Design an enzyme around this catalytic site. Structure first.
Site, PDB file in Angstrom:
ATOM      1  N   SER A 127       0.853  -1.188   0.000  1.00 36.51           N
ATOM      2  CA  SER A 127       0.000   0.000   0.000  1.00 36.51           C
ATOM      3  C   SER A 127       0.900   1.253   0.000  1.00 36.51           C
ATOM      4  O   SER A 127       1.762   1.373  -0.875  1.00 36.51           O
ATOM      5  CB  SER A 127      -0.962  -0.098   1.161  1.00 36.51           C
ATOM      6  OG  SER A 127      -1.897   0.966   1.154  1.00 36.51           O
ATOM      7  N   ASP A 151       0.095  -4.025  -4.096  1.00 34.47           N
ATOM      8  CA  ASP A 151      -0.957  -3.009  -4.387  1.00 34.47           C
ATOM      9  C   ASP A 151      -0.551  -1.636  -3.868  1.00 34.47           C
ATOM     10  O   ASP A 151      -1.136  -1.110  -2.930  1.00 34.47           O
ATOM     11  CB  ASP A 151      -2.356  -3.420  -3.908  1.00 34.47           C
ATOM     12  CG  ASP A 151      -3.462  -2.994  -4.876  1.00 34.47           C
ATOM     13  OD1 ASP A 151      -3.123  -2.601  -6.074  1.00 34.47           O
ATOM     14  OD2 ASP A 151      -4.662  -3.078  -4.461  1.00 34.47           O
ATOM     15  N   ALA A 162       8.283   9.990 -10.610  1.00 36.70           N
ATOM     16  CA  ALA A 162       8.966   8.804 -10.125  1.00 36.70           C
ATOM     17  C   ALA A 162       9.614   9.082  -8.774  1.00 36.70           C
ATOM     18  O   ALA A 162       9.437   8.275  -7.861  1.00 36.70           O
ATOM     19  CB  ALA A 162       9.986   8.316 -11.123  1.00 36.70           C
ATOM     20  N   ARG A 165       7.235   8.306  -5.885  1.00 37.52           N
ATOM     21  CA  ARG A 165       6.534   7.020  -5.802  1.00 37.52           C
ATOM     22  C   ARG A 165       7.483   5.868  -6.160  1.00 37.52           C
ATOM     23  O   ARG A 165       8.625   6.087  -6.587  1.00 37.52           O
ATOM     24  CB  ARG A 165       5.346   7.021  -6.769  1.00 37.52           C
ATOM     25  CG  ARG A 165       5.744   7.340  -8.200  1.00 37.52           C
ATOM     26  CD  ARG A 165       4.671   6.984  -9.199  1.00 37.52           C
ATOM     27  NE  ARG A 165       5.032   7.510 -10.505  1.00 37.52           N
ATOM     28  CZ  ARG A 165       5.702   6.847 -11.423  1.00 37.52           C
ATOM     29  NH1 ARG A 165       6.076   5.607 -11.176  1.00 37.52           N
ATOM     30  NH2 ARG A 165       5.984   7.429 -12.575  1.00 37.52           N
ATOM     31  N   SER A 167       8.948   3.274  -8.557  1.00 41.33           N
ATOM     32  CA  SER A 167       9.169   3.312  -9.980  1.00 41.33           C
ATOM     33  C   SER A 167      10.280   2.333 -10.325  1.00 41.33           C
ATOM     34  O   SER A 167      10.999   1.880  -9.444  1.00 41.33           O
ATOM     35  CB  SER A 167       9.468   4.717 -10.453  1.00 41.33           C
ATOM     36  OG  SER A 167      10.730   5.160  -9.976  1.00 41.33           O
ATOM     37  N   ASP A 170      13.989   2.375  -8.974  1.00 39.87           N
ATOM     38  CA  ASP A 170      14.212   2.423  -7.513  1.00 39.87           C
ATOM     39  C   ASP A 170      14.973   1.187  -7.013  1.00 39.87           C
ATOM     40  O   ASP A 170      15.491   1.177  -5.888  1.00 39.87           O
ATOM     41  CB  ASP A 170      12.888   2.629  -6.774  1.00 39.87           C
ATOM     42  CG  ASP A 170      12.302   4.014  -6.982  1.00 39.87           C
ATOM     43  OD1 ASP A 170      13.056   4.942  -7.380  1.00 39.87           O
ATOM     44  OD2 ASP A 170      11.089   4.154  -6.760  1.00 39.87           O
ATOM     45  N   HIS A 227      -7.593  -5.375  -1.627  1.00 46.07           N
ATOM     46  CA  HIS A 227      -6.341  -4.651  -1.482  1.00 46.07           C
ATOM     47  C   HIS A 227      -5.316  -5.606  -0.867  1.00 46.07           C
ATOM     48  O   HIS A 227      -4.230  -5.813  -1.416  1.00 46.07           O
ATOM     49  CB  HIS A 227      -6.560  -3.382  -0.646  1.00 46.07           C
ATOM     50  CG  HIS A 227      -5.460  -2.377  -0.720  1.00 46.07           C
ATOM     51  ND1 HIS A 227      -5.042  -1.677   0.396  1.00 46.07           N
ATOM     52  CD2 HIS A 227      -4.702  -1.938  -1.751  1.00 46.07           C
ATOM     53  CE1 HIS A 227      -4.077  -0.849   0.056  1.00 46.07           C
ATOM     54  NE2 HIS A 227      -3.844  -0.988  -1.256  1.00 46.07           N
TER      55      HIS A 227
HETATM   56 CA   LIG Z   1      10.993   6.515  -7.705  1.00 40.51          CA
END
Ligand SMILES: [Ca+2]
Ligand SMILES: *[C@@H]1O[C@H](CO[C@@H]2O[C@@H](C)[C@@H](O)[C@@H](O)[C@@H]2O)[C@@H](O[C@@H]2O[C@H](CO)[C@@H](O[C@@H]3O[C@H](CO)[C@@H](O)[C@H](O)[C@@H]3O)[C@H](O)[C@H]2NC(C)=O)[C@H](O)[C@H]1NC(C)=O
Ligand SMILES: *[C@@H]1O[C@H](CO)[C@@H](O[C@@H]2O[C@H](CO)[C@@H](O[C@@H]3O[C@H](CO)[C@@H](O)[C@H](O)[C@@H]3O)[C@H](O)[C@H]2NC(C)=O)[C@H](O)[C@H]1NC(C)=O
Ligand SMILES: *[C@@H]1O[C@H](CO)[C@@H](O)[C@H](O)[C@H]1NC(C)=O
Lengths: 421, 83
Positions: A127, A151, A162, A165, A167, A170, A227
């Site tokens: 999450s 998820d 990116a 979050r 991506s 990473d 979820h």
């Molecule tokens: Ca990233």
């Protein structure tokens, strides 16, 4: 102790999977020894998500325990950011930056203080946790080995760039399970866009089977069933090492549902979960599979082609059919499916899936159900492509044609040809 | 380079006169099916080139099915028929 850091880091054990009894305190090298961290083994870091209570959800001991079943010599570290995860969502979401920076500082420390290799680190984020793991991976000194997104959260990340979050950049390899994408983009619980090297969409990702009316550990399972399913799919993968579930790359979920995307050619299929192949495709992936509602989860996929033949020229609409598969090992009888229309001298393709491990196919029975006159076709052969065994099978009627007559005896076909790919 | 009989669904006492050249790794197989139909009971035999066949006998919805394997040209003939 230039190490203020709010997040806590518990090293759990195969015999103590529930509580956070031993903490690794960054800036305190002696803690690592206290807790018996194994410098010779891989390290999982489990990063939870949002929590309306102050507490760990009941999936955390399950994932820890499964990881230790599959990897009994490993180190399983549970990251605790419960405090920041108990805020209103946009606040908790914002805190993914700080939890990520905390985790990167911790990993970077383990690297400087113990020459522990970062290519031995697998981050598993659920999450909001998925994005905390993404950000952490983006701030490690060397690139971490694998990130797994269970998820990843959608709201405020769907349209995020990116750095903010999860991506593909990473980690060396990033695999993502999307299990609750229902909704308009940016208002789905789970993120819609692929954010991995490999992005898998069980049941097309929008909603999971078994999540409508149930018996429902956790504060409100019924609402977060789809979820949380992402985690239980991963767990199920850890417990089925030598029996994984294929997922199949596909142009769309609609295409997948027609049976157009079985096929395992040139990484067109992969395994869901721990046993995944680290392809790192040229751009994206996007893969699909069906699953059961309860555990074992794995299902078998077949494509069925039927050419409906006759001299006389009728159409029928939303017609209902049962198909029965008989193999060397088992059978599954009376699998329902329906066809938008059924017209003469046309061929229809379609997806069948079954929980049952049939073995090699031998016989195949087809029943044309009457609808909740006097119409029937002649069928000589039926073609079936099996996803998991990459085999094309042809069945033909024991006699020169099998008559398929709506609301009567099922037409019977036996295998007359085999092929591999 | 191996040749196998390739005949979909022949009656018991028909001999097969179609053959195929199989490809790298393939062997000869034969599927016999014995059971009932609307028009009397029926023994059928099907023949083709396959990758890894396992022989089986299984009864599947009242009709007895037997698969046999072999690795020489035109060897895949029903057990009551001759080369
Ligand atoms: Ca990233
Ligand atoms: C840390 O983890 C290691 C194992 O690490 C795992 O396997 C390695 C080969 C690497 O691939 C690692 O990356 C991987 O995660 C544990 O090693 C285990 O302990 C000893 C030897 O170190 C072995 O125990 C037995 O001892 C008896 C003597 O009474 C003999 O009869 C046996 O033949 C055997 O030697 C054990 O097999 C070994 N396990 C493995 C898989 O090699 C180590 O225990 C652990 N460290 C700590 C601090 O717990
Ligand atoms: C579906 O497609 C097939 C074509 O492949 C059609 O089957 C054909 O139907 C014709 C009727 O015009 C049949 O012709 C018959 O041939 C026999 C000789 O065996 C002759 O004695 C009869 O007088 C008659 O002409 C034949 O069974 C068959 N032919 C072929 C080439 O398959 C079927 O009619 C098509 N249906 C539709 C609605 O398009
Ligand atoms: C079947 O047998 C006859 C010989 O009597 C022959 O003419 C025919 O070519 C054979 N079939 C094949 C595919 O060679």
């Amino acid at each position: 102790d230039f190490i203020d850091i709010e997040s806590k880091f518990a090293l759990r054990t195969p015999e103590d999977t529930a509580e956070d009894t031993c903490h690794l305190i960054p800036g305190v090298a002696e803690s690592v020894a206290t807790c018996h961290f194994n410098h010779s083994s891989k390290t999982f870091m489990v990063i939870h998500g949002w929590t309306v209570t102050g507490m760990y959800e009941s999936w955390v001991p399950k994932l820890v325990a499964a990881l230790y079943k599959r990897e009994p010599d490993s180190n399983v570290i549970v990251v605790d950011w419960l405090s920041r995860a108990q805020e209103h969502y946009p606040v908790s979401a914002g805190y993914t930056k700080l939890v990520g920076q905390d985790v990167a500082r911790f990993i970077n420390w383990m690297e400087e203080e113990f020459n522990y290799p970062l290519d031995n680190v697998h981050l598993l984020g659920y999450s909001l946790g998925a994005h905390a793991a993404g950000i952490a991976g983006s701030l490690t000194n060397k690139k971490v080995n694998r990130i797994t997104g269970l998820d990843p959260a959608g709201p405020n990340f769907e349209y995020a760039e990116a750095p903010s979050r999860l991506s593909p950049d990473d980690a060396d390899f990033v695999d993502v399970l999307h299990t609750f994408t229902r909704g308009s983009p940016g208002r789905s619980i789970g993120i819609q866009k692929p954010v991995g090297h490999v992005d898998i969409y069980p049941n097309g990702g929008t909603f999971q089977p078994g999540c409508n009316i149930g018996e429902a550990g956790d504060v409100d399972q019924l609402v977060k069933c789809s979820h949380e399913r992402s985690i239980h799919l991963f767990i199920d993968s850890l417990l089925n090492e030598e029996n994984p579930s294929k997922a199949y790359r596909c142009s769309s979920k609609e295409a997948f549902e027609k049976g157009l995307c079985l096929s395992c050619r040139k990484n067109r299929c992969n395994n869901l979960g721990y046993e995944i192949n680290k392809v790192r495709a040229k751009a994206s992936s996007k893969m699909y599979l069906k699953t059961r509602s309860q555990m074992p989860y794995k299902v078998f996929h077949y494509q069925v082609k039927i050419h409906f033949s006759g001299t006389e020229s009728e159409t029928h609409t939303n017609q209902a059919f049962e198909i029965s598969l008989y193999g060397t090992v088992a059978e599954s009888e009376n699998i329902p499916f329906t066809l938008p229309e059924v017209s003469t001298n046309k061929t229809y393709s379609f997806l069948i899936y079954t929980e049952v491990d049939i073995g090699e196919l031998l016989m195949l029975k087809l029943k044309w159900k009457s609808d909740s006159s006097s119409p029937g076709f002649a069928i000589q052969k039926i073609r079936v492509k099996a996803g998991e065994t990459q085999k094309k099978v042809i069945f033909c009627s024991r006699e020169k044609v099998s008559h398929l007559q709506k609301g009567k005896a099922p037409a019977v076909f036996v295998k007359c040809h085999d092929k591999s790919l | 380079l191996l040749r196998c009989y390739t005949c979909k669904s022949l009656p018991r006492d028909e001999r097969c006169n179609l053959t195929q050249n199989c490809s790298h790794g393939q062997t000869c197989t034969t599927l016999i099916a014995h059971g009932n139909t609307e028009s009397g009971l029926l023994t059928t035999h099907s023949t083709w080139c396959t990758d890894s066949c396992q022989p089986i006998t299984k009864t599947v919805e009242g009709t007895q099915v037997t698969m046999t394997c072999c690795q020489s040209s035109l060897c895949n003939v029903p057990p009551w028929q001759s080369s």
